Design a binder for these strands. Structure first.
Ligand code: ZN
Lengths: 58, 222, 61, 159, 105
RNA sequence: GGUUGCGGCCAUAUCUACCAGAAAGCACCGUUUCCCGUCCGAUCAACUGUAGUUAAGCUGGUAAGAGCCUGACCGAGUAGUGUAGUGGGUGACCAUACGCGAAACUCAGGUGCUGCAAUCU
RNA sequence: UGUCAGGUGGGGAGUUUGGCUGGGGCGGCACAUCUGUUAAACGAUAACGCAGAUGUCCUAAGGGGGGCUCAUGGAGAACAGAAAUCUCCAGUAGAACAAAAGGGUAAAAGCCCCCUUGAUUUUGAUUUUCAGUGUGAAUACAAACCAUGAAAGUGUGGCCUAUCGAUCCUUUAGUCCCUCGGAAUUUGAGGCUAGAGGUGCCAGAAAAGUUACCACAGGGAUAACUGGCUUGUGGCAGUCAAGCGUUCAUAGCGACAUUGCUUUUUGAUUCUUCGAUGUCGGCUCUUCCUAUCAUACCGAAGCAGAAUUCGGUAAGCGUU
RNA sequence: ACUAAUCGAACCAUCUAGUAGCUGGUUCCUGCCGAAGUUUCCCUCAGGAUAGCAGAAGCUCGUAUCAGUUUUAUGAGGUAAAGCGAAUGAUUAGAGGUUCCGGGGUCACCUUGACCUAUUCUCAAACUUUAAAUAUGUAAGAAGUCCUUGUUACUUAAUUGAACGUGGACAUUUGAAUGAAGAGCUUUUAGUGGGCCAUUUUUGGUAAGCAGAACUGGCGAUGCGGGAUGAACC
């Protein structure tokens, strides 16, 4: 009938049982939501610098 | 309704619930007069200051203050006359106590739900006090001292808990110790203001300091 | 009575022997167990722990 | 009933400080934010456009995006047993540079500087910081400084 | 709520691609137009025995309709839809407000 | 060092009274053809830097000034609080141990500081 | 008479008759949302906790720009009075900002004035609720086209925090696009992309009662008995003493408070019992408690005697 | 009411082993690991799905991209406290001062009806200047620091800058402390989704072995020594 509405008891026990863990930040994060003006550059800048090193590699 | 015994609301269980725009329908406090005796005497007329101080942290019901105030006045008045003292009820009845209204009639279980929506309606007022806070302050001439302590002793009996009669070293209701206030009053930095006194500060516009306190500048110069 | 920071008696979680029944595939493990142990070359250690992989973990090349 | 609106329980988090109401000082829009900068979040309530949620006030995270008037900040968030990544649209009025990171940066220039002279002379220049070490021995003289005794003071009502 | 009979809004009419003048009207649902796929199915399901076979709405909570505006480009005759918020009472371009006006009753 | 234009921090700059201001500058100030605007060239706009002028404004100074900003071994290690106890207390609460530690109050100071550019006895 | 159609038709048939809930029913909405507090200075946090509010309103009460400062107070000005309009001074906001509250706002986010429709299109990403799902709301952008401004810039509705709705079906718009599969055309239908018609039980069944004739599954997850916790309520006791008591507080009472005990009431609760603890009263019968009505022995009195009143030891003995 | 001891719908057989979110039962041992009663949604509250907690299968590597931790530095908060001679709201006592917007008593006539100022007392969950303690965000590098100059349709007045770079130099310490029990990732599934108590902070109630919450730890699932005895206390 009348049941307890809410109880955060043992909630932090549970989270720390498996450890509270960072998202393990990687180099080169996703360019997701990054300024579309900036992104439409970085494609071309990378395209230019790759061929430049390719031409440098001959 | 019959007044609930004070044993119920003795302690500071609940957070302060004063008269405000969220606390609309409340009765008024029983105590209305807070300064008694020769209340308009100057500060020097009543040098000795006695305090009735609670040693514990409870709630003084508003009307208990009124109840003790009439008793403290009544012994004091009849022993040393009307104008030999001035008592001030320091603490004030701001905490509004709550009562859950109940039906105790025949078979009241039907018409009443019990504890569903059991937020209590305002029952009265009380004065919240902590340890060491002054309840009553009487100021009088020093020879009157036996009378005021005994008179305060009769008032102590209307209060729950334990209270103490302390002979304060202050000069009356002032915040100055007796020997050094005498130096201040003698040096002339003190103008009465009906019931209390004005102090001359070393900081301020000198012209105003001269306006209120010519005697200090004359006393130093002379 | 000690506190236990980690799970006790925790199996290493890695295959130690091929839980296939294949006798020939255990002969190769017997050979490479000897080579991995009796040599300092990391290559034998690698191949020994690649012989235990399941069929899904041994994809065709 | 119960409310959990976008800005509930913010009676005091978005109050402008005492005598600090009104116009935001103009250095705010002048600070330059580059992707990788570590910034904290202190939402000055005066600017209503682009406020962060009340959870991020005080949370310090890196800037991943830089926009016309806003910058994009990454903040780790407590959700269950894992940290999530939260990319925020933040008007620059609500952020400021973190002074913790610049202290580390200026230290790095200090570490590089003293290591440079260590290359020439004085090897083992002791790069790493040292916490407060236990204090060494010393002599405490008494010329004119005889130890004056103290006694516990008797209880007085003082009232 | 009052909105004018005209509005200069966008027109993606493949020819305009720019803010153009519009004539605007209140959305009309239109005739139910039996032979619709649901109506053909519903008539087949309702015919026979068993009475009512699909739910019939009974409980009404809202009292408004989100008024939709039938934007109509004056040049290319392209019709577009714009939605407004809920409104108890709605008018189309009438009695333009004037601030410093008397208390006419 | 003063002034102006633009400012940074945003009262140490504010506020209320009094005093002072060489040179320059600022402003007040003079007039409505054009522009422009208002009930009203008072605002704004234009034009003369010409008739004058520190009275303003402004700037600086003065006040046992309020305020504001710092500090203080002044309050106060106070209130409060984290941890612990088979601590006291009927309870209310309180003391203790290991820590952290205020605010009001009082006292002592101070009253803008600079940045770019031009200019000035 | 046969078929079809319209009505009538609890005669009869099937089915339903929400949830939460200090048992249920009544009430209410705590069922979707919002503000402050509770909420214990990150966050999160409940109750049928408290104060309240929402299902709208606005072509302006949106957007931009320009001018000015508001509430109030004071001084004044024929009618003019506290309050008709004008003028000046002080005016840190004490006003206004559509609507609840809170936050925010001074050459403004307020009042007045000018122009306008960005309250538009394409989608995508992000924040809150969160499963990092949806809806809702919001932030930043990009590609466009517009609005305003001298420009910078601002604007993707209301200063911000609420103001709202899935699949199916209908309908409207767009793409003039796809399909109708034996070719073709046109109506017609079905698709794709944008909305609307609503589901407030608000992640969304289409749904009226009774059972004191009842039945089943169970439930002490939940009442009616008792017992237990507490004692508000009832009773009983105590401290102080303004007074009554001719005089006198305390012979006897005792207002105003205030401290306790009891489970001889009624409470509040749901811990035990729902695969049963036989549910009031009376008849009868025993024992126990003392908070004593009488009796034994006393003390006190405004007790001369007698009647009485209070109190002590005392439950042995009686109490029709 | 009665209708074969059966009646508010007989009896017999079948569909039928009808349905059950409900009750009871669910059979050998040992070993290792080992919980949950909470989120959200549901005509949902005796039940499910989903996340969480647990097992197993492991997989990639080999002391780290780590941590229920501290220090240092830098943020954020508005609770406790404190404050009303500080704002709003209240509030006790007085003291000093008014337009013809009231003298009510002789026309401007002392004239008791104001507010304003300097004090005084006590406050506040929906007040606050200020403001702790605890708890809380980030950082403490080799994915970094510095130098050189290449790409870009982006940005700047610019061959300025932004991002990514290219090549060069960066051990006693590769840039605080302590520890690491290996670290990281995946799959999959069981059970659970009725909780209860203790300290402290708490809300409603007079109070409760009352109802609801926050942190922590326990009992559930746990024996053993103590509290004569008891799930929680030591
Ligand atoms: Zn068009």
């Amino acid at each position: 009938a009348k049941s307890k509405n809410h109880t955060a008891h043992n909630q932090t026990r549970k989270a720390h049982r498996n450890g509270i863990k960072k998202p393990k930040t990687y180099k080169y994060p996703s360019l997701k939501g990054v300024d579309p003006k900036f992104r439409r550059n970085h494609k071309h800048a990378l395209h230019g610098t790759a061929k430049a090193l390719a031409a440098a590699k001959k | 309704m019959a007044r609930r015994p004070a044993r119920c609301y003795r302690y500071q269980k609940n957070k302060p619930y004063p008269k405000s725009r969220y606390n609309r329908a409340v009765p008024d406090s029983k105590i209305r007069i807070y300064d008694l005796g020769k209340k308009k005497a100057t500060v020097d007329e009543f040098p000795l200051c006695v305090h009735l101080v609670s040693n514990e942290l409870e709630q003084l019901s508003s009307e208990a203050l009124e109840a003790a105030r009439i008793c403290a006045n009544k012994y004091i008045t009849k022993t040393v006359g009307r104008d030999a003292f001035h008592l001030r009820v320091r603490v004030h009845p701001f905490h509004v106590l709550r009562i859950n209204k109940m039906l105790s009639c025949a078979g009241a279980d039907r018409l009443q739900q019990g504890m569903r929506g059991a937020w209590g309606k305002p029952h009265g007022l009380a004065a919240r006090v902590d340890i060491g806070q002054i309840i009553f302050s009487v100021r009088c001439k020093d020879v009157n001292k036996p009378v005021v302590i005994e008179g305060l002793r009769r008032a102590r009996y209307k209060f729950p808990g334990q209270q103490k009669i302390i002979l304060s070293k202050k000069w009356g209701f002032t915040n100055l110790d007796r020997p050094e206030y005498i130096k201040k009053r003698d040096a002339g930095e003190i103008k009465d203001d009906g019931a209390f006194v004005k102090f001359l500060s070393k900081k301020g516009s000198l012209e105003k300091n001269y306006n209120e306190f010519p005697e200090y500048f004359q006393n130093l110069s002379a | 009575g000690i506190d236990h920071t980690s799970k006790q008696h925790k199996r290493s979680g890695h295959r130690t022997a091929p839980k296939s029944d294949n006798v020939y595939l255990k002969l190769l493990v017997k050979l490479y167990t000897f080579l991995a142990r009796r040599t300092d070359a990391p290559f034998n250690k690698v191949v020994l722990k690649a012989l235990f992989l399941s069929k899904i973990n041994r994809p065709p090349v | 009933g119960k409310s959990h609106g976008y800005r509930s329980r913010t009676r005091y988090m978005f109050q402008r400080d005492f005598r600090k109401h009104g116009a935001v000082h103009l250095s705010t829009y002048l600070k330059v934010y580059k992707v990788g900068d570590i910034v904290d979040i202190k939402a000055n309530g005066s600017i209503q456009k682009g406020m962060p949620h009340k959870f991020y006030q005080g949370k310090t995270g890196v800037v991943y995006n830089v926009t016309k008037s806003s910058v994009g900040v990454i903040i780790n968030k407590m959700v269950g047993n894992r940290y999530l990544e939260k990319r925020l649209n933040l008007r620059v009025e609500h952020i400021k540079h973190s002074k913790c990171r610049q202290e580390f940066l200026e230290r790095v220039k200090a570490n590089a500087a003293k290591r440079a002279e260590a290359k020439a002379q004085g090897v083992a220049v002791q790069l790493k910081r040292q916490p407060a070490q236990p204090r060494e021995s010393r002599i405490v003289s008494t010329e004119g400084n005889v130890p004056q005794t103290l006694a516990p003071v008797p209880y007085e009502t003082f009232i | 709520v009052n909105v004018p009979k005209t509005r200069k809004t966008y027109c993606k009419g493949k020819t305009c691609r720019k803010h153009t003048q519009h004539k605007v009207t209140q959305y009309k649902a239109g005739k139910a137009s039996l032979f619709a796929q649901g109506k053909r199915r519903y008539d087949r399901k309702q015919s026979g025995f068993g009475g009512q076979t699909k739910p019939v709405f009974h409980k009404k909570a809202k009292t408004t309709k989100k008024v939709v505006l039938r934007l109509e480009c004056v040049k290319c005759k392209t019709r577009a839809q714009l939605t407004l918020k809920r409104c108890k009472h709605f008018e189309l371009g009438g009695e333009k407000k004037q601030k410093g006006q008397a208390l006419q009753f």
